[PDB]
């Protein structure tokens, strides 16, 4: 045993696409976005791929990767070497027959008339950005790729007593010096050694008000004399999803310890005395 | 994001008696049949001399050679004068060793050019079984352009 | 196939009278 | 018999001499059988003229295909194409006659 | 989730053939046509294929599609390339042994004698148009190919306790600049981008207040009388990242139409008089 | 959907051999003849093969039949071609 | 025809003589047909200069495609690119006028 | 639409003594086997010359060669 | 094979214009460990592309280069 919190059952999940090169939700956003409404969140451009197979979850496969140990003439096992370049992919089983799913499987609709999806004999280029969110109780994985090529993985499945399927292979491709793909959790990758506490110092000012940029948007203006509970509510009001109960404010004299889920910074100050108000990590 | 690659490329042959074939649309029952060698750049012989003991070589000459175009055509076996036999003989009548046919290529973004072409070897069909009994037959073409460029 | 040309001809000839010439 | 003509140019006003293709379904004119042939015509210095037998013809030009009725006297080619596209065979004689009327009222003979 | 109405069970279906190039029923016609009698309907010349296997359903396939990611000398992954060309087909398992099934499996009958189906040595050309209608409840997904070539896929099979079968492959071919094949459903393709709306009906209440859920979490209290600006305020005031400028609220007499980037539902009713409050998906 | 009467379950059946070229019973005769006694038939010369397996019914195979779509240089799918001759057979389990 | 111009440089102020591409949708103008030929134009040490027919044209350069309305008087190419319209010229009405004009030119009163 | 391909092609050998064989119907016990080479066109040798140090080549002449027929017969 | 003047046809054309049999192109290689060197290179055979199917309908094409440096060194 080591970290039971990192052990994963892929009980439910979501699949999205966007234009090539578009950014995913940040690790701190993924923990609170509404997964069924991608038009609601600040990293715009994501659309849901529709229903996906309930059995036959996304398979994160690869082609290539065959390897040799290189041996010396005297039977010394020197190093292991790749003979063929690893081409990573994911296979996704689509299970609705709307234009949303057919455009991933066949490429763009070749018919202009209402109620018809047409297909022709040419070659199709079908590049997308791809996001998969896997939900495991209150844990949320993201997988993101900036560029994946889409193709038919296998034929259309039809049955008398199971959902039909449209199996697609998404194959990860290089784009503009980014990573080929990224996994996403604030708690599991590049983790902080301890919970971050910010320091707010009033700087010897007297009278007036000041305005934090908590989570990258402006707070409601805070008076110079505000106590820790007054700051707790002023941060816990212009939320972006993080309720008041998620934060913690404590103090000693003119120095306030601010802590919570998102970042803290100072935007505006009345500048009534001393240095003015300031904030540090 | 997503796209269909559907080029406007038109391939036509004008035969030595002025008979025309559209090898893209196959309105005469004949189509250009996959692998083509010898469109694009013509073959060149570059001569270098490697004499004495100094490092590397000297350039002497380069010459454009004849084009050897190698291609096939797929001939559909339909009814009446649209049988494979009537079409492969109409195809054969368009070509000569002594007279030039023209192969015309047209694109939207580069326009129209043509190549003057002759038989270099006799057109050939494989005959595992009677070709009149086959559904389609491929006739294999080895053709020469002795004037190797494409003309407006 | 049937073709439009007589129809357009009748419409133009009709209005060349019904809006009289000059 | 009848002479059909145009002047054909690129967007710079220089000549365009790409081929125009003329065809017809198998039919009878003045005793002649007219056949399914495709005839290729090149404009010469940007001037296009072709003799055509009157009645039904097919014109293809690049991606475009048009079915035209060649009239019994000499005519400009684009008017025949414009007739084929602007007023299809199954149109209402009523609303097209009022459209013709409307343009005639804007520009009398 | 997204469109559960677009999820498909192939619970029943019908196969037709016609002469090459024949037009299928339009999307609006397919919702109404009598599937048992194709002699009756507006786009004529479809015949039923006969009965087909009730568990080995029409099986789509392809040959080719051999495909390669090709990289640079420096191991960048550039693009994905088709190497062997996609050839595309359906397999249909036929279960009648009438001449209408045998003409698909063997080609044309080589006997003129009544009661005989004759077969000869030689290749057969066997082109048809193909139409498949798949049915579950009120949904009818259509599939059409203008030109398919028909061949024997496998041996005829016989059992003492199952329907014997004639398996045929229909491989799709190019014809007169048409699409290779089409899928037909009026609701699902080239459709109207109609926005989602929630109809808030206050039920004829005359006192008290109500509380919506927006994005699955509670607003405050909304009085039984309130204008669209007070609704748009109470909806926008909730803890999610959505601004009061992203939501839309508009009047239709007694009822408001709500629209915006999240789901809306009724959380608490504390109104008096009327039916009580209701919010419904339009 | 068309003929229910044309759906076949092969619950019983009979296999016969004759000298090469022999004519079968006519379609009308096949409705009437006694299947256990080929000696009674108007089309003479047929003889029963003996008993045959009731698990391993006659299998109507073929070898060959490998086939390809012929395709244009511009990817148009033209026609299917048979590459090999279809050699057609029945397997009988005596 | 109308003269359309620009001066063309790289980031270091040296001339850039890569080709500009001009085209149009098939249409009649002054009885001539304008034919969708793509015309390649080299700048002459900077100094792009092309004579164009007024009305709709397509401009292509590298990755970009623009739709422009060419004025009835001389103009700078960048002004037309900055004011570029989304895809559609409304060509449907012109074909009826072309038909009635071509008819009246063929059989006048 | 639907059609069986059965050509009316009849192949016969008349021998050096005036004996006859039908290779299509095999009434003499002999049939033409699969794989025939040399029917359709006869071989041609085409000849070209180099024009000196200039593009392409010039046509000189062409000759129809002897016809080599390679086939087999199936003897029952 | 992208869109407009970034199509494969236009790039394979621009690529072909960079090369000749008579005049040198320079192939420049830079590394952190040796810095910059260049090689003077010319065509030895004409550039070729596989045409199994129309290259304009293919999403990527390989053009095969056979080139010569008759002055064989990498220069600073």
């Amino acid at each position: 045993a080591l970290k039971d919190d990192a052990v994963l059952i892929a009980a439910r999940g979501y699949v999205y696409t966007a234009a090539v090169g578009t950014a995913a939700p940040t690790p701190s956003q993924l923990k609170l976005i509404d997964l069924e409404h991608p038009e609601a969140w600040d990293r715009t451009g994501w659309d849901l791929v529709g229903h996906t197979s309930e059995d036959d979850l996304p398979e994160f496969g690869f082609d290539g990767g065959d390897s040799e140990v290189r041996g010396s003439w005297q039977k010394k096992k020197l190093r292991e070497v790749e003979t063929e370049e690893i081409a990573d992919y994911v296979v996704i089983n689509l299970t609705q027959f709307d234009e949303t799913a057919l455009e991933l499987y066949f490429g763009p609709n070749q018919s202009a008339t209402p109620g018809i999806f047409g297909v022709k004999s040419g070659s199709v280029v079908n590049e997308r950005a791809l996001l998969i969110v896997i939900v495991d109780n209150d844990v949320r994985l993201g997988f993101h790729a900036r560029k994946a090529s889409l193709k038919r993985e296998d034929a259309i499945s039809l049955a008398t007593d199971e959902f039909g399927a449209l199996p697609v292979r998404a194959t990860f491709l290089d784009y503009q010096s980014y990573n080929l793909y990224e996994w996403i959790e604030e708690d599991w990758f590049n983790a902080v050694d301890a919970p971050v506490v910010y320091l707010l110092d009033l700087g010897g000012a007297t009278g007036g008000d000041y305005t934090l940029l908590v989570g990258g948007k402006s707070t409601g203006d805070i008076a110079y004399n505000a106590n820790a509970s007054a700051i707790k509510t002023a941060i816990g009001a212009v939320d972006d999803g993080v309720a008041e109960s998620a934060w913690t404010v404590t103090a000693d004299g003119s120095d306030f310890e601010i802590s919570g889920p998102l970042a803290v910074a100072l935007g505006v100050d009345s500048t009534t005395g001393g240095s003015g108000v300031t904030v540090d990590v | 994001a997503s796209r269909l690659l559907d080029p406007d490329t038109l391939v036509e042959l004008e035969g030595v008696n002025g008979e025309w074939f559209d090898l893209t649309n196959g309105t005469e029952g004949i189509y250009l049949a996959t692998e083509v060698t010898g469109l694009l750049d013509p073959p060149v012989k570059a001569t270098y001399e490697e004499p004495g003991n100094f490092p590397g070589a000297r350039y002497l000459n380069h010459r454009v050679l004849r084009r050897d175009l190698v291609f096939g055509v797929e001939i559909l076996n339909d009814e009446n004068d649209e049988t494979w036999l009537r079409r492969d003989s109409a195809w054969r009548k368009a070509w000569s060793f002594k007279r030039d046919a023209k192969l015309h290529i047209t694109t939207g973004e580069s326009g129209h050019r043509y190549l003057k072409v002759r038989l270099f070897e006799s057109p050939t069909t494989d005959m595992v079984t009677d070709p009149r009994g086959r559904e389609v037959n491929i006739t294999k073409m080895v053709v020469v352009a002795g004037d190797p460029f494409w003309y407006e | 196939p049937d073709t439009s040309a007589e129809l357009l001809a009748d419409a133009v000839n009709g209005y060349l009278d019904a809006n009289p010439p000059s | 018999t009848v002479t059909i003509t145009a002047d054909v140019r690129d967007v710079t006003g220089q000549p365009d001499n790409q081929q125009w293709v003329f065809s017809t379904v198998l039919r009878q004119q003045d005793g002649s059988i007219l056949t399914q042939k495709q005839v290729r015509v090149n404009p010469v210095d940007g001037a296009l003229s072709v003799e055509l037998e009157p009645g039904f013809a097919i014109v293809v030009y690049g991606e475009y295909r048009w079915f035209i009725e060649v009239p019994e006297t000499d005519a400009g080619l684009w008017g025949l194409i414009a007739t084929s596209v602007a007023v299809p065979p199954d149109t209402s004689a009523e609303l097209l006659a009022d459209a013709v009327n409307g343009y005639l009222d804007a520009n009398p003979p």
Side-chain angles (χ1 to χ4, degrees), chain A, chain B, chain C, chain D:
Chain A
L2 178 62
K3 188 168 179 167
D4 313 39
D5 301 342
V7 178
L8 186 86
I9 309 290
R12 301 194 311 105
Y14 298 85
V15 184
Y16 314 84
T17 64
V20 168
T22 51
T26 73
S28 59
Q29 291 168 351
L30 178 60
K31 198 167 182 78
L32 55 71
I33 56 177
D34 188 4
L35 293 175
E36 316 214 323
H37 292 277
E39 66 265 58
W41 66 67
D42 65 303
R43 290 291 211 226
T44 58
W46 291 98
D47 56 39
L48 277 159
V49 157
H51 292 101
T52 60
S53 192
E54 293 168 18
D55 52 356
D56 307 340
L57 296 192
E59 294 283 18
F60 287 97
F62 68 90
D63 301 310
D66 288 349
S67 297
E68 299 186 339
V69 297
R70 297 307 300 164
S72 82
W73 193 66
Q74 308 196 25
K75 313 265 282 194
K76 197 181 298 291
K77 299 180 223 299
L78 305 177
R79 181 162 273 171
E80 192 172 45
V81 72
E82 286 144 9
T83 298
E84 182 163 36
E85 298 71 30
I86 294 77
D88 293 311
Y89 61 85
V90 64
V91 173
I92 293 149
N93 292 291
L94 313 177
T95 62
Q96 68 176 57
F97 282 69
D98 183 85
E99 190 168 311
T100 303
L102 297 204
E103 195 267 334
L104 300 167
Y105 190 85
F106 294 121
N109 188 349
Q110 299 306 312
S111 186
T113 59
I116 292 181
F117 193 104
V119 182
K120 299 190 198 302
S121 282
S123 189
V124 173
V125 177
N126 197 356
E127 298 166 34
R128 286 289 229 280
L130 185 81
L131 177 72
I132 300 181
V133 179
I134 305 102
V135 185
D136 184 3
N137 298 330
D138 61 351
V139 174
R140 291 179 175 192
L141 279 164
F143 172 91
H144 178 234
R146 292 276 183 156
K147 183 191 280 216
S149 170
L150 302 185
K151 74 190 186 205
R152 302 197 273 173
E153 173 55 16
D154 195 3
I156 297 180
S157 298
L158 297 173
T160 309
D161 62 351
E162 274 298 349
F163 297 137
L166 280 153
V168 304
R169 193 198 202 107
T171 304
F172 317 130
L173 293 178
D174 275 299
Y175 178 78
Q176 300 195 354
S177 75
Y178 295 101
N179 295 304
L180 189 70
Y181 48 89
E182 289 174 334
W183 299 91
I184 308 169
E185 279 100 352
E186 190 163 40
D187 301 301
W188 296 359
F189 314 125
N190 292 326
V192 194
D193 190 37
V196 181
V197 181
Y198 292 85
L199 175 149
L200 182 153
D201 180 0
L202 298 176
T206 56
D209 53 40
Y210 67 90
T211 312
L212 303 176
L213 304 181
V214 287
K217 34 60 184 166
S218 188
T219 192
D221 306 332
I222 308 179
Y224 81 104
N225 71 334
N227 69 68
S229 186
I231 297 165
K232 174 77 179 291
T233 186
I235 294 180
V238 191
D239 289 351
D240 189 19
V242 290
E244 182 182 18
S245 61
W247 296 87
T248 284
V249 187
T250 48
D252 184 11
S254 306
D255 174 351
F256 297 84
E257 298 168 319
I258 298 174
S259 61
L262 307 183
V264 186
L266 178 65
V268 180
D269 175 6
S270 299
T271 312
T272 51
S275 60
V277 186
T278 193
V279 182
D280 195 10
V281 183
Chain B
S2 66
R3 191 163 56 101
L4 183 75
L5 303 178
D6 183 22
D8 58 27
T9 316
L10 182 76
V11 187
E12 284 178 302
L13 186 89
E14 183 175 46
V16 302
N17 322 293
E19 62 275 83
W20 281 81
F21 298 79
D22 182 336
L23 301 177
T24 295
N25 298 296
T27 42
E28 302 71 50
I30 303 192
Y31 297 84
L32 188 70
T34 58
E35 67 188 334
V36 182
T37 294
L39 301 178
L40 311 180
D41 287 329
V44 171
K45 175 169 49 168
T47 298
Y48 280 74
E49 66 174 11
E50 203 155 52
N53 302 348
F54 76 89
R58 286 192 296 252
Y59 167 93
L60 294 183
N61 190 56
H62 78 291
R63 196 181 84 72
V64 183
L65 311 182
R66 58 170 156 88
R67 287 186 188 270
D68 298 357
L69 263 69
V70 183
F71 68 95
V73 298
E74 279 151 332
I75 306 184
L76 299 185
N77 196 0
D78 304 323
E79 300 177 56
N80 308 310
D81 266 38
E82 305 300 324
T83 56
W84 162 80
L85 171 58
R86 194 52 44 190
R87 289 171 169 175
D88 186 77
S89 54
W91 178 248
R92 186 56 188 86
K93 283 199 297 153
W95 288 95
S96 181
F97 292 87
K98 193 180 292 184
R99 289 149 62 195
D100 50 330
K102 294 171 298 182
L103 181 70
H104 297 268
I105 302 288
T106 306
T107 69
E109 54 52 65
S110 193
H112 168 248
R113 307 179 189 176
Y114 72 85
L115 185 74
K116 294 167 293 181
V117 288
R118 305 195 192 181
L119 298 176
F120 185 67
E121 304 191 348
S122 300
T124 291
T125 314
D126 198 1
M127 297 163 75
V128 186
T129 56
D130 178 355
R132 306 207 305 148
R134 281 204 152 287
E135 319 90 321
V136 187
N137 298 287
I138 184 167
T139 289
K140 298 180 181 180
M141 298 292 296
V142 183
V143 314
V144 57
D147 180 5
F149 309 109
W150 291 82
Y151 281 87
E152 302 197 328
Chain C
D2 47 347
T3 58
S4 318
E6 65 183 27
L7 213 190
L8 187 282
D10 283 350
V12 177
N13 289 3
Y15 274 96
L16 183 60
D17 294 345
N19 302 338
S22 65
Chain D
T1 47
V2 174
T3 298
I4 301 305
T5 72
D7 179 61
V8 277
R9 293 176 185 284
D10 69 40
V11 72
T12 74
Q14 294 287 113
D16 183 13
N17 306 317
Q18 284 192 23
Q19 72 189 354
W20 290 72
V21 182
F22 295 92
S23 193
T24 193
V25 297
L26 207 156
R27 70 186 180 92
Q28 195 213 218
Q29 275 295 124
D30 294 339
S32 299
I33 299 183
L34 305 183
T35 70
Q36 290 278 11
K37 183 70 62 63
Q38 291 175 19
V39 182
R40 272 155 273 253
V41 184
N42 291 304
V44 177
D45 303 339
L48 174 70
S49 62
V50 57
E51 274 59 59
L52 291 171
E53 297 298 80
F56 181 93
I58 316 183
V59 186
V60 313
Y61 187 67
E63 306 97 310
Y64 301 104
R65 168 180 293 250
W66 306 285
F67 308 119
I68 69 168
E69 189 77 12
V70 179
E72 301 93 336
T73 59
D74 301 345
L77 192 146
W78 185 258
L80 309 185
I81 290 178
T83 303
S84 76
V85 183
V87 52
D90 62 350
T91 46
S92 155
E94 306 85 350
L95 49 59
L96 80 90
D98 198 26
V100 166
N101 169 47
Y103 177 55
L104 289 171
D105 190 38
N107 183 23

